[PDB]
Structure 1
């Protein structure tokens, strides 16, 4: 076409990474042109219908790759980077977007380089990456298996290896969306992922950074299959901070969220070792830990579980008042 010609021209124009070393006026002029070009195409692909044709796909993916797939410093050109993120996001979210054509260019190497950007120290960038990968996962069925494995590899390298990662939280938030949409009978690889990966994540000392997201994944797993709650709770009690620390509040938060979605038949399977730990928390030297544990009695659903099993639980919580 003719509009298609100009669109492709502007996309390729944003593939030129220039830098005027000693001419501030020309540098600002150049950076503005690219900023304007990106802004134009963002508005264009967003509000105009039937503008994404087949020749556009290899151009957009290339422009994204050239601009984003870089090396992270241990940014400053974020205004341009955010535009690229927003444009590529409008590209995927468009009603005219056809995965059948795009899967030729959005391949495993693209997904791999996209995942390597999750190690960015910029929270804004990881947020754009979280949204993008979530969209790619849902729109590309043939990539879902590869994505899960690579995310799995990053976690294993974060836990048992030594590689520090800055996007563990953002990655866990993506998984939460995936877990919530699992098939009726959970596959074995999913159960393995819960037991061999998600649970040992509680061991890492930097748990505080990604704990809310980790807890959500664990809970969503139990809402799918309540059978998995016994190895989950027992492992949670294993990884429980032996050294009385304010980090106990996180475990207490996660534990109550688990109890809010637990089955009665599953409750009696782990109620004794749980409330023995809970009893220790009420007797804690740290007030914050005791305050959090005592708040369990306010949970009306837990009370019903306790009342149904008061003969076994009450002697644990109040030894000088009750016996077996």
Structure 2
């Protein structure tokens, strides 16, 4: 703790020795005065805080403040703090949904360096080629591990750093894309202690929006090998909203992927969790507002077979959303064209639930479904309901 004499502010300093004063301050704040101690360095903290507070002012003000010779010092300045040893988790069985978030000790001073980083990457000049030699593949590699943090406030600031690097640095796009694929591939089948994937998935949303058309083989393998199996995640309840968007947006680029996506969706269907299925049905419902009629002609049997299974559910919410399927406009338009094949599958199950369930509200919607199919080629309904009753007469024979 060497005494920190307050050097003259850069406002008082003239044109000369400005970088020398600037560089000296960066070496002055490169120290690691820890904040774990309750009461220590009662004078050293604020002057460091004041310098950083003035430093953020210095970068925002003026234009020619940043020079090439300073590039090394800033990277050393930033890397000395952000590239820290992350504290161990307070509880290995910590619940992100239930337990309160864990805070950070050095946050009052960390709030300034991340701000310093943000206003630096967004600087008016920021020649990337000069920074290309200094911000190399090694800087990014340690940056990704910082997403494993536990403080929610840090993740939002961290994410904006990654997007700024990717949008400006044209050299490491391949690395960060490959790194993004690599880091996700761990999360699908591993210990999976990662907690910043919700913030991580936000970056994936803005990287697929730029995927040029037509697709390439590398981008094709992203869906069936990474994104689709991600629905088997234990904690999908927090990542589904961002995970649902990228599937739809990616599908909107090449419509030929609709068949593999739907079949892939039906493979990892939830089995024992009621809440998992409710959001899962919302995924399939969204897909049907962008589906093409020709692509419908290939998924009538497998997709609708599952829907006819989920209506006969033991939970109201699972049946509630499924019954709301016969309320859309595009969905009803599609099922009118191929009524001949859809009707024989549901109608056996839609009629059974009509007079067995207890809640009138679920039964009330069922009447609307059955009456809706009477607004179609009802001769087939008449052919069905004449034959179907004979199959129920066949079931009456089973009773007999």
Per the TM alignment, residue 203 of structure 1 is displaced from its structure 2 partner at its CA by 1.4
Q: In 2, distance between residues paired with 1:132 and 1:227?
A: 35
Q: Structure 1: 5+ residue runs without aligned partners? A: none
Q: Name the structure 1 match of 2:78.
A: 64
Rounded to whole Å, the distance in 2 between the matches of 1:144 and 1:162 is 28
- The answer to whether the 8 A contact 1:19-1:27 is kept is no
Offset at residue 251 of structure 1 (A): 0.9
Change (3 A) 1:112 1:302: same
Shift of 1:9: 2.4
C-alpha contact (below 8 Å) 1:279/1:317 kept by paired residues:
yes
Secondary structure of the residue aligned to 2:171 is helix
Q: Secondary structure at the match of 1:246?
A: helix
Report the counterpart of residue 373 of structure 2 in structure 1.
none
Contact 1:246 1:286 in 2 (8 A): no
1:228-265 Cα offsets, whole Å, 9 max, x none, are: 12111111111110225211112112222222222222
Work out whether residues 35 and 105 of structure 2, in 8 Å CA contact, stay in contact via their aligned partners in 1: no
State the alpha-carbon separation in 2 of the partners of residues 176 and 94 from structure 1.
25
Q: Structure 1 198/45 Cα, relative in aligned 2: closer, same or farther at 3 Å?
A: same
Structure 1 pair 268/12, CA: closer, same or farther in 2 (3 Å)? farther
Match of 2:303 in 1: 274
Instruction: Identify the range of structure 1 (103-112 vs 236-245) with the bigger mean alpha-carbon deviation.
Output: 236-245
Q: 2:321 aligns with which of 287, 292, 297?
A: 292
**Please, which of 141, 150, 163 is the counterpart of residue 170 of structure 2?**
141
Query: RMSD over aligned Cα, in angstroms?
Result: 2.2
Q: How far apart, in 2, do the equivalents of 1:310 and 1:16 lie?
A: 73
Bigger-Rg structure (1/2): 2
Give the structure-1-normalised TM-score. Answer: 0.91
1:55 matches 2:69: yes
**Matched residues in 2 for 1:31 and 1:298: separation?**
63
Partner of residue 237, structure 1:
266
Bigger shift: residues 94-103 or 289-298: 289-298
CA distance in structure 1 between the partners assigned to 2:329 and 2:178 by the alignment: 40
When residues 196 and 9 of structure 1 are mapped into structure 2, their CA distance, relative to the original with a 3 A threshold, is same
> Is contact 1:169–1:209 with CA below 8 Å preserved after alignment?
yes
Residues 241, 52 of structure 1: CA spacing in aligned structure 2 closer, same or farther, 3 A cutoff?
same
Number of aligned residues: 323
Tell which deviates more after alignment, 254-263 or 213-222. 254-263
1:108 to 118, 125, 137: 137
Give the alignment's TM-score, normalised by structure 2. Answer: 0.75
Higher helix share: 1
Secondary structure at 1:199's aligned position in 2?
helix
The 1:85–1:302 alpha-carbon spacing in structure 2 relative to 1, beyond 3 Å, is farther
Deviations 1:164-185 (A, max 9, x none): 2111111111011000111111
CA contact (8 A) 2:184 2:226 kept: yes
Conserved? CA contact 2:59–2:120, under 8 Å:
yes
Shift of 1:19: 4.1
Give 3-state SS (helix, strand or coil) of 1:224's partner.
Answer: coil
Q: Distance in 2 between matches of 1:27 and 1:258?
A: 59
